[PDB]
Structure formats: structure tokens, C-alpha cells
Amino acid sequence: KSPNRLVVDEAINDDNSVVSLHPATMEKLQLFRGDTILIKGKKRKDTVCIALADETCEEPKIRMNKVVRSNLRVRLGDVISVHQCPDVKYGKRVHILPVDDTVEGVTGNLFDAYLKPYFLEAYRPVRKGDLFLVRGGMRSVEFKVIETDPAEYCVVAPDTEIFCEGEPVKREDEERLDDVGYDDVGGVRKQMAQIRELVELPLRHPQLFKSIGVKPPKGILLYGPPGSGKTLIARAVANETGAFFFCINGPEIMSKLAGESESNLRKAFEEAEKNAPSIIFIDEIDSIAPKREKTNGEVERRIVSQLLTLMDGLKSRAHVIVMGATNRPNSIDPALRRFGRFDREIDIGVPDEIGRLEVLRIHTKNMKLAEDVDLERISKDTHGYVGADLAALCTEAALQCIREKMDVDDSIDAEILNSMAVTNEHFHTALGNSN
Amino acid sequence: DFSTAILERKKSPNRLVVDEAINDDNSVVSLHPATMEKLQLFRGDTILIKGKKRKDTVCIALADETCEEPKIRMNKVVRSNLRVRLGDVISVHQCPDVKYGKRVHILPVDDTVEGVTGNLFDAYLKPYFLEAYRPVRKGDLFLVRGGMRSVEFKVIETDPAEYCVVAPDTEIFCEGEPVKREDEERLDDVGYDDVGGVRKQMAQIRELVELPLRHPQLFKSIGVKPPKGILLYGPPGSGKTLIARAVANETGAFFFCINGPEIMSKLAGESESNLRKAFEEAEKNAPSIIFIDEIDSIAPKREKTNGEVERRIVSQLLTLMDGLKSRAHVIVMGATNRPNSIDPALRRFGRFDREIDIGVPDEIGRLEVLRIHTKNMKLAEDVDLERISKDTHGYVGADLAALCTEAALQCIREKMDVIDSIDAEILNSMAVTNEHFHTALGNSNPRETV
Amino acid sequence: KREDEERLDDVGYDDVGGVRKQMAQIRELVELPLRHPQLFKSIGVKPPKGILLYGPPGSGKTLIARAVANETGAFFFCINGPEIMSKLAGESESNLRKAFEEAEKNAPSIIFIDEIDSIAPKREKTNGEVERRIVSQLLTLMDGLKSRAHVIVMGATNRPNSIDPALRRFGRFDREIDIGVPDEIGRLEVLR
Amino acid sequence: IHTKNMKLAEDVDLERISKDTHGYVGADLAALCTEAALQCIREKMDVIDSIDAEILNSMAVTNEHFHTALGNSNPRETV
Numbered sequence A: 001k002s003p004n005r006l007v008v009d010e011a012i013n014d015d016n017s018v019v020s021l022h023p024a025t026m027e028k029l030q031l032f033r034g035d036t037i038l039i040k041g042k043k044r045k046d047t048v049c050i051a052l053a054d055e056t057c058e059e060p061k062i063r064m065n066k067v068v069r070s071n072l073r074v075r076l077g078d079v080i081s082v083h084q085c086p087d088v089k090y091g092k093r094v095h096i097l098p099v100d101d102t103v104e105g106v107t108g109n110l111f112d113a114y115l116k117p118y119f120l121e122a123y124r125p126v127r128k129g130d131l132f133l134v135r136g137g138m139r140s141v142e143f144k145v146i147e148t149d150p151a152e153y154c155v156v157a158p159d160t161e162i163f164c165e166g167e168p169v170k171r172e173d174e175e176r177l178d179d180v181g182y183d184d185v186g187g188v189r190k191q192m193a194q195i196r197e198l199v200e201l202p203l204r205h206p207q208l209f210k211s212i213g214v215k216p217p218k219g220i221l222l223y224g225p226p227g228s229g230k231t232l233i234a235r236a237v238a239n240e241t242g243a244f245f246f247c248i249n250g251p252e253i254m255s256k257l258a259g260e261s262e263s264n265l266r267k268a269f270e271e272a273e274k275n276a277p278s279i280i281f282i283d284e285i286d287s288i289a290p291k292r293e294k295t296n297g298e299v300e301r302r303i304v305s306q307l308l309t310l311m312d313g314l315k316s317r318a319h320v321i322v323m324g325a326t327n328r329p330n331s332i333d334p335a336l337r338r339f340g341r342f343d344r345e346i347d348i349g350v351p352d353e354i355g356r357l358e359v360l361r362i363h364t365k366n367m368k369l370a371e372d373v374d375l376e377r378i379s380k381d382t383h384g385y386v387g388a389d390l391a392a393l394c395t396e397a398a399l400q401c402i403r404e405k406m407d408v409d410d411s412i413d414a415e416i417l418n419s420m421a422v423t424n425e426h427f428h429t430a431l432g433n434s435n
Numbered sequence B: 001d002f003s004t005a006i007l008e009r010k011k012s013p014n015r016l017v018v019d020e021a022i023n024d025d026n027s028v029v030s031l032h033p034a035t036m037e038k039l040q041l042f043r044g045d046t047i048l049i050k051g052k053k054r055k056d057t058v059c060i061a062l063a064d065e066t067c068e069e070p071k072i073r074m075n076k077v078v079r080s081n082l083r084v085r086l087g088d089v090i091s092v093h094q095c096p097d098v099k100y101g102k103r104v105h106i107l108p109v110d111d112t113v114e115g116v117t118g119n120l121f122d123a124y125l126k127p128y129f130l131e132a133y134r135p136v137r138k139g140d141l142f143l144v145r146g147g148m149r150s151v152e153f154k155v156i157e158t159d160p161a162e163y164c165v166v167a168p169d170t171e172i173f174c175e176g177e178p179v180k181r182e183d184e185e186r187l188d189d190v191g192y193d194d195v196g197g198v199r200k201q202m203a204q205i206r207e208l209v210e211l212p213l214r215h216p217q218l219f220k221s222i223g224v225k226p227p228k229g230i231l232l233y234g235p236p237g238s239g240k241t242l243i244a245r246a247v248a249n250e251t252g253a254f255f256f257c258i259n260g261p262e263i264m265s266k267l268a269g270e271s272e273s274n275l276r277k278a279f280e281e282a283e284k285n286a287p288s289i290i291f292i293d294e295i296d297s298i299a300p301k302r303e304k305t306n307g308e309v310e311r312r313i314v315s316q317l318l319t320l321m322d323g324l325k326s327r328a329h330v331i332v333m334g335a336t337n338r339p340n341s342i343d344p345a346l347r348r349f350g351r352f353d354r355e356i357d358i359g360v361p362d363e364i365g366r367l368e369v370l371r372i373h374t375k376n377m378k379l380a381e382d383v384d385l386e387r388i389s390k391d392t393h394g395y396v397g398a399d400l401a402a403l404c405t406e407a408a409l410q411c412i413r414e415k416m417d418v419i420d421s422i423d424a425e426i427l428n429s430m431a432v433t434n435e436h437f438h439t440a441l442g443n444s445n446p447r448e449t450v
Numbered sequence C: 001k002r003e004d005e006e007r008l009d010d011v012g013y014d015d016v017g018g019v020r021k022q023m024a025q026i027r028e029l030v031e032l033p034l035r036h037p038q039l040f041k042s043i044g045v046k047p048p049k050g051i052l053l054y055g056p057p058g059s060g061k062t063l064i065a066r067a068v069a070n071e072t073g074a075f076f077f078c079i080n081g082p083e084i085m086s087k088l089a090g091e092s093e094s095n096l097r098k099a100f101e102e103a104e105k106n107a108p109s110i111i112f113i114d115e116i117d118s119i120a121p122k123r124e125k126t127n128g129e130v131e132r133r134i135v136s137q138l139l140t141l142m143d144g145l146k147s148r149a150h151v152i153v154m155g156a157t158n159r160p161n162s163i164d165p166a167l168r169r170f171g172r173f174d175r176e177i178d179i180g181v182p183d184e185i186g187r188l189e190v191l192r
Numbered sequence D: 001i002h003t004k005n006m007k008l009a010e011d012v013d014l015e016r017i018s019k020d021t022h023g024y025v026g027a028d029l030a031a032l033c034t035e036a037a038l039q040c041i042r043e044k045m046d047v048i049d050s051i052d053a054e055i056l057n058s059m060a061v062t063n064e065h066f067h068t069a070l071g072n073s074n075p076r077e078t079v
Ligand SMILES: Nc1ncnc2c1ncn2[C@@H]1O[C@H](COP(=O)(O)OP(=O)(O)O)[C@@H](O)[C@H]1O
Pocket: A184, A185, A186, A187, A188, A224, A225, A226, A227, A228, A229, A230, A231, A232, A233, A325, A359, A362, A386, A387, A388, A389, A391
């Protein structure tokens, strides 16, 4: 099968049209830099991308963003086959329409706001049926390639007509491109790699441990202050693995009646086993299962014990990974840290200057920023900030930009939103109104 | 415009509606002779059909005067191999490059071969392809019947590549560990072809459910609110649960099953919490079908309610039905063998508006049911399913289904002595005789007045 | 002292008289699922689960059940109508579940529900709220039981017409055996 | 009342329907209109996908659609 069969790895550069390969691999497959290649994925889907040389890319691997991955019906770690296509001719005309659930509330023409600066002197390969994401104007719009001339695939050149007449397309059997991924979690590089190593094998290759006599981890405890991205990391891991995501919420369980909280707790574990490979995320795990001395309620002790037995009763053959999250690790019941329950513990602290800059880049993706904007300087100033603190600073600087730039019905055009830039003055005003 | 001309010309005689097959063959699709004349296709010709999720298959096209001009008759296997359902639109295309197979690699699906032993080729694939010249496409899944069960197989590879016709000179490779099921439902799942003796009742249910469940966005433009609740009536074992599962599978609707005793077995308050959560899940995963089995266990008449918390559950069901909107895309199906014991408040407009009576099957209807539960069975020439239907007067669907399973066991005991454990090639060879059906009739436990 | 061998005085088919035809019927239904349980894994045929034994008190319904279990080597769990109904509210259903759970764990098994009319009587004869909760618990336990579990449930009652009709449904108590009063020949067998 | 937003054919006789629908209440008659409306949607419109306003406003419910709705309906006064 080798060498055309390669392993799917993360992209350094987020471009919907570019895939990165090792220069020795491209030499073996006789592909030059800038050449358009045809990649074949799962569910009989395929796409066309620009192949680029990368020394940091592993020889048997391929670097590609979430858009390329979704268009190939693959996930990180899966295998695709790269093929060369000489039929790649420039586009005469392409029919592109948006996805209705990504244009809710959006007004004006989407060509001048999104598609025009997207394809401009980029010479993007385009294949019929593909879906791509364009960022700008405080949001991101998903677009489907309805038709291409010449048929099946073409390169969108400056002489290519981009036809956009028609009602937005409805979503079909393919997940949102705006869904949480590893590219949306910043400042936790080491912690993310640790979690990924523990979960990727049991969730991506569950049948593998049927042959091996090794039982993998079940429970993971995420530690860290509120808004440090514990919920985010869990959703990111579940989306990136294709694992079924069930979310248990500490207060949600504890708000229910006596007996109803237990019934909900067992039904949550039951559903995860049924839809496995799964990830059970217990948010605010200290609401349920706190220390024996701290809580004195009779039915409360019954819930802590219910959680422990549900963890014990869970088998490695069930293919369910339970993720607990708390900002109070020392308030949590020590019986949960037992072997067979929450064996491993990951501490997601406060992000450093570098980590904060990463987080700031994430929540400015769909935002037009001025040259006067220094995200490096903001990260230098925002010392005690967590992921949510930095995310809130961006949203505040965004709505400060909306008020300051726009005056005078309430539905604002996409072309106008995409043009307004957030300044250093908007970020300074947001910093002053934040603690 | 260019792309506008493409989309508006999607009214070509090459675009047809998916209808049911009269003859159950995984390789044959039926079309109207005037449609094949328009599409320049001859009887016996192999055609390429393209469906949904960029999936396609190759079938033998056959002329049928009973087939509608804008429709196409295809079985559940062909339907699934195209990622389509009855009522959907596919496009038929000319297939002139179908060369005979050099070699095909075929493997079964694990969940269909649980407990099965011996060579699957001599038992299933060999009589399946024999002088049939079956078109075969890579990635396809098909069903083979015999030996008291049905095995699902996957087409792993074809030579020549992608598609070929399995001829007598084609090598069939079927060795290795069974494949694991991935993103595809079981071909043995209950469908309209598994429900017999209720032709008129099935057509009625289908008309009421197919539009709201297959085209839910259609009633957003139209100001017409469709039915929500349907009451199925009929004696125990008349296929009420079956019809519900068949309708849900055939529509792709999410199937949530509420069971009368299951709800009533729970504590006070737990039964209503479960009842709410059932309706909530259906709305979340809609288009959905809520099936309330033994609806008379929950919601009986106010006279028959001899409990305080019991009347609280009847009222909970009524408000859940009232609280359900057309915009939710959920159809509630209730089933009872005691229509007169059910609370009359359920029959109100906005709750259970329509009622379908699934009675006892007649001679014709019983023969249909007998054909269904002998699908995976080898029958002798001495067997006369027409004569069994003539005798089994007053038998419901379950009574006839039990008669087949008993005649099947009577055949296992009578023909097989000491094996231990049976393998597929021996199970596929043993035939159920008229003597086995006579013995099953002698030990059976099965009325209609004006 | 006894070691790894059952009592030779244990009840067997040779201890049940006057029910020749009924015994042969029960034996045909139970022997294949209980003696060859792995056989129905290859065959796509699902065998019977529930059997209702009918007959006056002291006609050997409990005896037939113990005889069948001993002769097959099946694990015998005995549920007693009054024993379940003597327990508190909630304790009766917990016991009822645990009985079905133990039988599945130690399968091939035979659950024998004696005086099945004490539990699960007709909906008219149920003059209690928690009583109707037990009838419903039994029906769902029968429905929740799979063929793959290798458990056969045997119910016994002297009042077949007082029993809830929902038990006779396909998937619960599919087959019914009437063990009447023995005739001259049958009585001589019992006397021997 | 329940044909207000519906295009009706000249072949439609609401006077004759009222003559036949003896023992029908308000809801029974309202359901007969909605059923005749759906019977018209299925019979007139083939494959669209989703219908637009100018085409919906043009399709007329016929006496045949009301006859078909009457045939599948589920509807007494003594001294
Ligand atoms: N590392 C991070 N990178 C990006 N966004 C972050 C990060 N940490 C927190 N956020 C954002 O802050 C918000 C609140 O954090 P959340 O997901 O609830 O985690 P936690 O459980 O630690 O509070 C979310 O919208 C999340 O996207």
C-alpha cells in the first residue's frame, strides 16, 4: 500500500486548501511544491489540495486542518491515500452557497464580505460537494461547493465566475466546522498532549485492547481555576476523536429530587455505554461527590457512593472514558482517586505570557484587527487572566468597537461588519472594565 | 444561467422516485417499460444508480407494467446500498462497462455470524451467485437467507476494480475474520416486507406518517398541521409493535419505545419523570416516533383507575400530548388490545386524532405472514403454505410466527441426532416437512362477530 | 460426609406420577434450551421463556418444577407469591429483580414462581397502588429477559382465570400446561 | 372558515359537503378541510425539493380531494 498511504496529523498553518508533507515523501511520490494533489478519505469522499514541503512533518504523516479532515470524513490518526491529478484546469464558473445554520441573522451580500477576499490571488483548488469555513465580521460562515466548471474539480482563478444565487443549503450528515477542536484550546500544550495519549488509543482503536490483555484508563481528573478551559478540553477531545459526548453537570444533578439525582446519574452512565466509544464529562464534580466530613446530608452521601459504584461497575470493554472537572481538588472525596475510578489527574493551571497570547489569537480569529493592535503586549499585561478572562476581553473589545464605529434597522450588514477593525483603544477600554 | 439550468433540469426522466419491490432480489431493480424506452435501457441490462451520501450501486433493470412511470421498484438491500429510503429520488445512469469478475473478496458482518460455524461459501454465497450473473460493487452489503437465519456480507474488493458481474468463472474469496459493522443499520431490521395481512392498514399509516417524517420542513411553508397521535387497535400478537418498528426503520425516524408496564413498574413520580424524559428525547432527536405499547396500562378509563398517583399519570400523558407541537416533528403511536378500556380523553383532537384497527388476518393475510417466517427456512415440496393458511383460521401474526419456529425446532430434533454445535452448510440443507408443520399445529394455543 | 455430589433422594421424573403427557410436553420445551444452550446461538430460533402450570393445590406443580431443574442440572431459583408479598413496599420489587438477576448469572436456570396469582393478579382484583407496581415489575422483568440469558420462567397457579391476562402475552408466558386431577391409572402411579 | 386560505375549484360545492357531513362537529369539518388540502398537495405536486408561495397559491383543492377526505373520516341527537 505504501508510500501513497499516509497518517493524518495537525496542520501548523490553518489553510483550507493547503496540505503539508515531508520533502522526502514528495520526492518518493513525485510531487512538487505548489502542485495540486487528490486526497482520498473515508465514506467514499475525496478532496483536492496544494501540496507543500515541511521538514517538521513526519515522513509517513500528512499535515491538514479541520476543514480538509471534515471534507475527507477522517480524524487525526486515520490513514488517507495521496494521488496525483493532471485534470486540474482553472475554473470557468463555480456555484457556492452558505450553510443556513451558519448564516442565521446575517444580512447583505456574502461574496464581498467572505468569498471575494477568500479566493483573491489564492488560486484555490475546489471540489464539488466540499464545505469550507471563512472567518470575519465577528463570526464564521460555512460554504458548500454546489457545482464546478469544468466538472468535479477546478482551481478558482481571477477569471473564474463565482455564482452565489440561491437559498442557503441545509446541513446534512456532516458536523459544524465551527465545532470545538484542538486548535481552539491554548496555553495547555503539555496537558493536551498528556490527555490525547491517554484517550486517543482507547477511543480511536477500541477493538485493539480486545486482543491485548492491557486495560487502559477510565477516569481522568482535570484541575484548575474556573474558566481555565476544562469543559473546552473535554469537548475538544470528544469532537477530535468522534467519541459520544455526554455531559453530567454537578449542580444539574444536585438540583433534582431525592432518587431522581441517582436515576439521572445511572442513566447518564448507561447512555454512554450504549453509544460508546464515549466521554462522560462530569462538570463541577465537587457538587456531587465532595468530602465525607464537609457534607452531612443523608441522600447526599448516597449520591457520592452511587458515583463510586458507577465508576467501579464500568468496564474497560465498555469503551467509556470519564472526565471529571473541579477547581477545588482538595474538596473532592479521596475515594475517587482510587485505582479503578479516577486513576489519572491533569493540572490545567493559569496560562503564562506565551499561553495567553495563544488564547488571544483564538478569540480574534473572526475579528478584524488593526496594525495598532499588539496581542503580544496584551498577554504581557493580562498576568492573572485565565482562558475565559482573555475570551471576555476580546468580546468586550469587540462590542466596544461596534458602539464606537457604528451609529444608526438593528440588522447590520456582513460587508460592513467585516470592514470594522478592533483597535488598541478598544482593548485598553476592555482592560479597564475588567479585573 | 449555467448552474441554474443544471438544477432546473433535475426533472429528467433519469430522476425517479424510490418505491417497494414486488420481487425481493438484491441485484434487480424494476422500472416501467415506457420509462426504459425514454432512458434507452433494455431488460436485463445492468444500470448504475446513484443515491445519497455520494453512494452508488449496479443493478439489473427489468420492465414492470405495474411500476409507475416516474418511480423505481427496489428492495431494502438496494435502498440501503444507495443511502436512500422509500420516497427519495435517485438517478439512473447507463452502465456499459460491466465486465465479468476475475476475483471478488466477500466477508460476512460479525453481528450476523454470531454462533455460526463451517464454510460460509457452500452454505450461502455458492447458491446465491449460481447462474444469477449478479452485478457487484465494492463497499456494498447484501443479505443471504438460509439455515434458520440470514447472513450480511460485505464486498471487500472486485477485479476489475470498483464493479463487476459475478460469473461462473469468477473466483469468490471469503476467508478471514468477519468485518465489524460501521455507520450502517442491520439489513435484517424489520421493514414493510416483514409485516403481512395488513395491506390497507399499512397504506393508511404510511400516508399519515411519510409526509411529516420524510419531509418535515415542508409543513413550515404550508399552514397545515399534520397528525400527532395514532391509535393502533388489535388482539395481542397482531403486529402492532412490529408495524411501529417497521414504520420508524423505513422512515429513518428516531424510535423511542414507552412500555405501559415499564412506566407503571417505577415508583411514584419516577413514572411521570420517565414519561416526560421520553417525550423530551423524541423532540431532541426528531423526526421521531414515540411508541407507547400497552397504552391501557398507563392512561386507562377514569372508572378503572383505582389509584391516586395512577390518575396523575393519565393526566401527565394528556398534557404531554397537548404540549407536543407539529413543529416538533414527533408522531406518537399508541397500541392496545382493549380500545374500550382506554381513557376517552386520548381520542380528543390534538392528542390521538386517528385510529387504525389491525384485526385478525384472513386466509390471504395468513399466507403472507407464513411466507415471512419461512424466509430463512428450507421448505420441502411437500410443504403447502396455502393449505396451512386455509387451516389456521383464527390465528394472529404471532400464532403463525410461533407455528413456523415450532416446525423449525421439530425439524432440528427429527433430522439431527448427535453433533456436539451445528455448522451452516448442514443447517442450510435440512428441510422443514409438512409432518413438522402438522406436529406444530397439533400443539398450538391460538373469533369475529357482527 | 457428602462431597461434590447431589442427593440421590432428590426429586426426579420418577417421583412425578399421573402427568405422563404433561411431563413429556414440559420436557420437550425445556430440555433443548437448558441442556444445549449454545445450540440456539448457531440457530436463529428463539425458544420459549415462560410456562404457566395450571392445576388444583397439591397436584405437583412445585414438584414438576424441581424435577425438571434437577434432571436438567439447571440452577433452581424459587420465587414464592406470599414470600414476595409479605415484604415491605419496594423490598418486594427489589427481591423480584434480584431473583431474575441471580438466575441470569447462574444460567442455565429455572425461575419458579409459586402461587403466581399472589403477585400479578387481574387489574380488577388489584385493590392496591403498590400491588399494581409489582404486577408491572413482573411483566417488564419477563420482557427484559432475553433468550441468550438461558433462563426459563415457570409460573404456577390453581386460579388460571384470576391471573392477569397480560402474562399470557408472546414474550412472557407463551405456553400453558394444565395438570389436572389424576385418573385411576395416574393415582396408582402416585401410590407407588 | 377552514377554506379561507385555500384555493377552491368551481367543482367544489361547500353546500353539498354540509348536506353530507351530518353528525360532524367543528373539528370534524376542520379536519376534512386539512385532509383535502394535503390530498391536493400530494396529488398536484410531484418532486420540488420546499414549495414557494406563487405555486402554493395556484393549486386548487378539487371535489375529488374532498371526496377522498370524506372516505377517510372519524366523526347523534335524541329527544
Ligand atoms: N485555553 C483556552 N483556550 C481558549 N478558550 C478558553 C480557554 N480556557 C477557557 N476558554 C474559554 O472560556 C470559556 C469558559 O471556560 P470553560 O470551557 O467553561 O472551562 P472551565 O470548566 O475551566 O470553566 C469558554 O467559552 C472557553 O472557550
